[PDB]
Design an enzyme around this catalytic site. Structure first.
Site, mmCIF file in Angstrom:
data_model
loop_
_atom_site.group_PDB
_atom_site.id
_atom_site.type_symbol
_atom_site.label_atom_id
_atom_site.label_comp_id
_atom_site.label_asym_id
_atom_site.label_seq_id
_atom_site.Cartn_x
_atom_site.Cartn_y
_atom_site.Cartn_z
ATOM 1 N N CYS A 17 0.704 -1.318 0.065
ATOM 2 C CA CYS A 17 -0.025 -0.021 -0.061
ATOM 3 C C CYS A 17 0.836 1.585 -0.086
ATOM 4 C CB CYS A 17 -0.813 -0.090 1.350
ATOM 5 S SG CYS A 17 -2.144 1.316 0.987
ATOM 6 N N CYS A 19 0.676 3.736 1.402
ATOM 7 C CA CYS A 19 1.092 4.234 2.798
ATOM 8 C C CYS A 19 1.989 3.139 3.543
ATOM 9 C CB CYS A 19 0.019 4.370 3.799
ATOM 10 S SG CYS A 19 -0.832 2.784 4.147
ATOM 11 N N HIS A 22 -3.368 -3.892 6.839
ATOM 12 C CA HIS A 22 -3.650 -4.631 5.623
ATOM 13 C C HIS A 22 -3.284 -6.129 5.968
ATOM 14 C CE1 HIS A 22 -4.317 -1.122 3.299
ATOM 15 N NE2 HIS A 22 -3.431 -0.630 3.929
ATOM 16 N N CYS A 83 -7.162 4.197 5.132
ATOM 17 C CA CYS A 83 -5.943 4.445 5.527
ATOM 18 C C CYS A 83 -4.975 5.660 4.700
ATOM 19 C CB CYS A 83 -5.363 3.201 5.568
ATOM 20 S SG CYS A 83 -4.683 2.468 3.920
ATOM 21 N N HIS A 135 -9.675 -15.741 -5.460
ATOM 22 C CA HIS A 135 -11.053 -14.868 -5.403
ATOM 23 C C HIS A 135 -11.140 -14.017 -6.700
ATOM 24 C CE1 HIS A 135 -11.872 -15.940 -1.341
ATOM 25 N NE2 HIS A 135 -10.641 -15.669 -0.842
HETATM 26 ZN ZN ZN Z 1 -8.490 -17.048 2.618
HETATM 27 ZN ZN ZN Z 2 -2.620 1.365 3.511
#
Ligand code: ZN
Ligand code: ZN
Ligand code: K
Ligand code: K
Length: 382
Positions: A17, A19, A22, A83, A135
């Site tokens: 990220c 930043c 996470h 964030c 996913h």
């Molecule tokens: Zn999982």
């Molecule tokens: Zn972040």
């Protein structure tokens, strides 16, 4: 040298990220890689350099537009996180600089390892790889996934090496909605999942035992869906019992040539109840890995998916790699082998076996013996 293979690449660490807050971060694959070397198993395994996946490879699972959007860095659909960082979701980050590459690398690595094992150059393998993939849908990124690496390897084994029967076991605590959709009508590949389901009240909300397939693929999608909440949570005893009653019987009857595993370690101990809340031990994943090595001649690869607690994923990695090598596994506690599975696990297994008996032979032979523990099943068959 015919052995267990590994893939890693530090370039995957760059997907971070802009930043922390996470669960899916760089230090996941890193700490796993340090663990492998500390135990010495990296020094016993053959390492393979990986590559970025070509756009056309990715387009075997995903739409053209999707592949362009999260695969290419040229010269919109992006969001501001709580964030401060950039994302495509409220969950899943995006690094305009280092993500497209890292995601394509994650896929490419799990095509090298895969082809090397399936071709004969290697026995079996474990891919230390991020971001996860199972996913990711046709046109939708989600759950930290951008491209379904395992589904891409599968599709390519179909098209390149022309492998006839492929089996995907997915044992991440979440349902692999991506991997199911990818083959939901394909009889040549059996997808079976073991996920926390809870009547569809858990991420990503799919994976009913009801869901079996369509057309020629009907009955080639097995959803070992665990309903019941966390009273008591599912543990080693409950999964070993699920493998013995659902997975192995079905998988063996299918008799595949290649076994692919979406091996997420979200199920293990020490995971906050939103992320998993299951009581699996790391040591246990060995036995599950070992039970699959019996299939397809041992043509098996494991891809890292989920698993977020640093201590947990390292343990289950070293356990899984040791199993893949042929190391004598530590005996599972007498407590565990003797422990009977809870009524919720039994209800789940029985519902699955009920639906899938219409599609498999050995599920028509017996009445439910799902209730027994391991030692109580070992003795009852003797
Ligand atoms: Zn999982
Ligand atoms: Zn972040
Ligand atoms: K799963
Ligand atoms: K299928």
């Amino acid at each position: 040298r015919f052995t267990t293979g590994l893939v890693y690449d530090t370039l995957m660490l760059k997907h971070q990220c802009t930043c922390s807050s996470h669960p899916e971060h760089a230090g996941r694959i890193q700490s796993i890689w340090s663990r492998l070397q500390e135990t010495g198993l990296r020094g016993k395994c053959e390492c393979i350099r990986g590559r970025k996946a070509t756009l056309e490879e990715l387009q075997t699972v995903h739409s053209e537009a999707h592949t362009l959007l999260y695969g290419t860095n040229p010269l919109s659909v992006f969001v501001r996180l709580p964030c401060g960082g950039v994302g495509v979701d409220s969950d899943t980050i995006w690094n305009e600089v280092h993500s497209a590459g890292a995601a394509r690398l994650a896929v490419g690595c799990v095509v090298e390892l895969v082809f090397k094992v399936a071709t004969g150059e290697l026995k079996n393998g474990f891919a230390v790889v991020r971001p996860p993939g199972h996913h990711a849908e046709e046109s939708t990124p989600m759950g930290f996934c951008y491209f379904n690496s395992v589904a891409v390897a599968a599709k390519l084994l179909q098209q390149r090496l022309s492998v006839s029967k492929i089996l995907i076991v997915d044992w991440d605590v979440h349902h692999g909605n991506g991997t199911q959709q990818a083959f939901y009508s394909d009889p040549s590949v059996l997808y079976m999942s073991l996920h926390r389901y809870d009547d569809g009240n858990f991420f990503p909300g799919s994976g009913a035992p009801d869901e079996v397939g369509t057309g020629p693929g009907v009955g080639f999608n097995v959803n070992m869906a665990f309903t019941g909440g966390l009273d008591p949570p599912m543990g080693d005893a409950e999964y070993l019992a699920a493998f013995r009653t659902v997975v192995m019987p079905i998988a063996s009857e299918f008799a595949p040539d290649v076994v692919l595993v979406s091996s997420g370690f979200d199920a293990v101990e020490g995971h906050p109840t939103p992320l998993g809340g299951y009581n699996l031990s790391a040591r246990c994943f060995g036995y599950l890995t070992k039970q699959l090595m019996g299939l397809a001649g041992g043509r098996i690869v494991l891809a890292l998916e989920g698993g977020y607690d640093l201590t947990a994923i390292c343990d289950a990695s070293e356990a899984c790699v040791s199993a893949l090598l042929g190391n004598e596994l530590d005996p599972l506690p007498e407590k565990v082998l003797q422990q009977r599975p809870n009524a919720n696990a039994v209800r789940s297994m029985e519902k699955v076996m009920e639906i899938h008996s219409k599609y498999w032979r050995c599920l028509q032979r017996t009445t439910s013996t799902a209730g027994r523990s391991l030692i109580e099943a070992q003795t009852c068959e003797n």
